[PDB]
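Holo model, magnesium ion. Inputs:
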Amino acid sequence: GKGDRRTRRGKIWRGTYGKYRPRK
Amino acid sequence: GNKIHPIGFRLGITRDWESRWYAGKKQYRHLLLEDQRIRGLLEKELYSAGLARVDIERAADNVAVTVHVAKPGVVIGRGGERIRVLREELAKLTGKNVALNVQEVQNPNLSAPLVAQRVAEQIERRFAVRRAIKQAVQRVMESGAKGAKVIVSGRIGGAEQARTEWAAQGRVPLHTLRANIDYGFALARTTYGVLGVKAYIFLGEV
Amino acid sequence: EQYYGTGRRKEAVARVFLRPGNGKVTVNGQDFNEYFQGLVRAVAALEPLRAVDALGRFDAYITVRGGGKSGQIDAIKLGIARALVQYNPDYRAKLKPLGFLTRDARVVERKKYGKHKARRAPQYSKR
Amino acid sequence: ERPKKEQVRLKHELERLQKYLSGFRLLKRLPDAIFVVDPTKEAIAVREARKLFIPVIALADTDSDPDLVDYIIPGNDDAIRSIQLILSRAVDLIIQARGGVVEPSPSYALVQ
Amino acid sequence: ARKALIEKAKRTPKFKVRAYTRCVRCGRARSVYRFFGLCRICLRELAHKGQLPGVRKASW
Amino acid sequence: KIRIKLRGFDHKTLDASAQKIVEAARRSGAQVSGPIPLPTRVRRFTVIRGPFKHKDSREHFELRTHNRLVDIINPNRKTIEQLMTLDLPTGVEIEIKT
RNA sequence: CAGGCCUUGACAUGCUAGGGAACCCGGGUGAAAGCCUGGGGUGCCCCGCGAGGGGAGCCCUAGCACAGGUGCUGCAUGGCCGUCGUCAGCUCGUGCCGUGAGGUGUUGGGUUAAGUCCCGCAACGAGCGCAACCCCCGCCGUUAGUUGCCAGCGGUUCGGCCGGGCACUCUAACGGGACUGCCCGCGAAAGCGGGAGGAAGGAGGGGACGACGUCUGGUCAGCAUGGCCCUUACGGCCUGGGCGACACACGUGCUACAAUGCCCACUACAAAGCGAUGCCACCCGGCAACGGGGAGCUAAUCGCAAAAAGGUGGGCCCAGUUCGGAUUGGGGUCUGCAACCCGACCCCAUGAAGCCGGAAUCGCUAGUAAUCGCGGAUCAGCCAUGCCGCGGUGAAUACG
Ligand SMILES: [Mg+2]
Ligand SMILES: [Mg+2]
Ligand SMILES: [Zn+2]
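Output:
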């Protein structure tokens, strides 16, 4: 969920970006 | 104790800011540390005249430093020598062109920060606090006022039992905005500790 | 020619227009049924137009901007009702009887300090 | 000016002010005496006067204790008959020491 | 141990890492506002006074 | 042609002194797009009332920076003497660009 | 806290003394602090050809008076806050009853959110409270237009982009509105219930405002301050450690145990703020953190920016699982003298407990509760899931 860093929501709630939530 | 500052509460209406200028973010902390350090020496070497306000206005490197006093016969000096060294002490720390107007006091008995100091003193002089309060009130009313309220903190007569002296007359609507109630706070530094004085001179309705 | 209505509700703002004609309806340069596709609430906005009987008499062009995909729909329902009350004085018997006229003062209130969400106070210990 | 608030208010305030003080204006000085119907009724009054040494005249009956009335009018205190007969010739003997002897005063209008 | 520190804070002869803030009127290092140069206490204090230009009580 | 900003704090003074430069610029030649009100920039900071440890019922104030723009259409040598010398800002600021 | 140092002391001011005096650049030892040490030479007040000499600021050394203390006492205090409690209450003046404490008013009847108001009454007034004055959303208007719009003819490289325009929208300054003033019903009134008009009635919905006072409440550690206590140290510098230690227990919170769901590509709708060695558009290097260049902003004109839930159709098919992200190994990146203690971000792999929670217990009456996302302040960075603000979706129930 919003705790698993490696997800689309886990990247959102934690206000950071990565391979699993890049900048467009 | 509660009750929000009657000055900060009227600020919207009634009381016009006791320092009304502007300053973008970049510089404000400094015009602030200035205005402040200024009131720091104007309330020391000038209290002998007893100032009850220091308005300060600005625009670009000029300053108002307007001082309101009930006794300006020590503010101007003996012909124009005193204030001559007070526009000097000002620009001494302030690298600007600091002016200095002066208004008087249409009733030191109708100014609160004045009556608050008027009492503050009587306490460091060992006066009967009860009477020094019932008095500093009966002084404001005999002298054209609608309401008066004077409050002393603890250690009256130096008593190890800290009390709280309370004296009022007429009307003092502190929940009202159309109160125009002057207020000011003076201390007192007696040997038996610290004292406190609140001054509630309700002036005009509307 | 054009029939304008002042749509607005809960930080949303809809500018509705009415040119006599087909029946089509547009919102922000996109079909009405395509912009609000998946919202079973959408077709409720055109509800005053079904108590006046004149849906296929008015080609609605709306440009709503601000609020939420639904808050907009509420504002739209005011400007679909307020727009056909202007060009028709007898059409006052659907904006008052069938209450269709109010901005719905139902706005989000301020969050108070010591109140997680304006009213939902924190957890109580006592122990 | 004055919002519709103070108009309803200040009006009412004058209304009642009036309601109770229609006759208690006149002299702004302590009455040299007082005349009263049923003294046991407004004995409160009688007390005031008595505590102030103000002479007291009044029309008391058996309902009322004589002793505490300085000048005593012994007679009916309810039927409007006797009341007018003693109020009349009392206020009549009042003006007969100022001049202006008149006819009786308004009394009958539904007097039985 | 407060006096030496109020001056030790102004003094930036050591790394800019250690160069924190500090309330101007009182030696308060916490709840310092970069804008006013005061802490939460003094801020409220001066604002109640009016010595804070265009700084007014909130009412929304 | 010439743009003039009016920043400051008080909306009663920042309003009167931004309507003065509206009748004295029309009297000095070119027209002047009247006093325009752009969005006010708020600055709210919250401080705990208690000097000690009272995280609840605290107190916060605002700082209302009221912007106000005014534009003069044509750069006379007339207005340039009315404005460049009629500097009367009591607690106000004014920028000038082109 | 251990260790290594400094005493007219890190900061104030006053006075005395030969020397030097304003200041800049170093070196030796050392963990740093500190201690020791090597180099240019000064516009000043002035007798003076000059040498030279007096000398005022500042500075350096010695000495002196004293600085300094987050050391104790918040039952010695100021200031300020919490609290009962937005509770309807709390008192004074005169008169009156009482030997007096003290009543009376402020009780009684009716009404209201309320000592709100009316009617009563040995009382009649008044003050502090309540309400009212103040701010927000509201409904509408005047003034003002670089945000806004084929809204109208217009040209348009096909994006309000260009012309062109204040009608919209908005922005923000000022006003109008709602007052038991109209109709019905009850009554002596205050007043209530019912209805029309209206964007909105009977304080319209939220704020700011919290009475004499109570808790010998809280704070000497923000500060102020009475007394006490310390002074080559209870002061002061600095290097490191510590406040993050852990067999446990409580509180407050975050994420969940799943199909009203998790996961992927793609597509939409907020508000409020915020930004100069600061927010970073567009590029290229990198799975990425981020990193090389680089347009724009003094900021309704550019940037943070993507809002998320939601909309479209696609895969998992009830499985400790594609549910759930702790734990740990390995490899990195950014701020910073420094990430071992003890930072956050990033990638691969580890994939723990938990399948809805004993007894007990908390919140909320409508845009509320729940649920989703964003900003700000503090701040190099950040252990923020915290706090203060903002809005999108939007209920359940109130017999008593
Ligand atoms: Mg009252
Ligand atoms: Mg409630
Ligand atoms: Zn402070």
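Residues 40-49 of chain E form the longest helix (10 residues). Residues 1-60 of chain E form a domain with the 30s Ribosomal Protein S14; Chain N fold (CATH 4.10.830.10).
Archived with the compound record.
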